[PDB]
């Protein structure tokens, strides 16, 4: 009763039912470093301007 699969059949991506649990950390990764403290707020003008030496703006 065997039927030869047609051209293209064996190259399909099929789906498999497995009771095996899906791995959690297959790469065995460590905890990632914490991101740098984000910056939030309202952008206001620079206090007294550039403050470069004698410049007033």
């Amino acid at each position: 009763g065997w039927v030869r699969p047609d051209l293209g059949d064996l190259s399909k991506v099929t789906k498999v039912k497995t009771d095996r649990p899906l791995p959690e950390n297959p790469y065995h990764s460590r905890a990632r470093p914490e991101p740098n403290p984000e910056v939030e707020g309202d952008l206001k003008p620079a206090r007294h301007g550039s403050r470069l030496f004698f410049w007033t703006m």
């Binding site: 403290p37 910056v39 206090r47 007294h48 403050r51």
Partner: protein
């Protein structure tokens, strides 16, 4: 100008200059900490972007 105007004008000048001097000292301290620790927006030297990584199944499994 009367002495009062010059006197209180002087105070306004001193307040501005004193505030700028404190900010100048704080900036030197903030820059010193960011450069040594790397935890601030300054001295943030780039690292490779992780969105360049291809996560799809590969030709071989062990990777």
């Amino acid at each position: 100008d009367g002495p009062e105007k010059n006197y209180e004008r002087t105070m306004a000048i001193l307040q501005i200059e004193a505030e700028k001097a404190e900010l100048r000292l704080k900036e030197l301290e903030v820059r010193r900490l960011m450069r040594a620790r790397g935890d601030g927006p300054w001295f943030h030297y780039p690292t490779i972007d992780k969105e360049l990584i291809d996560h799809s199944p590969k030709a071989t499994p062990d990777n």
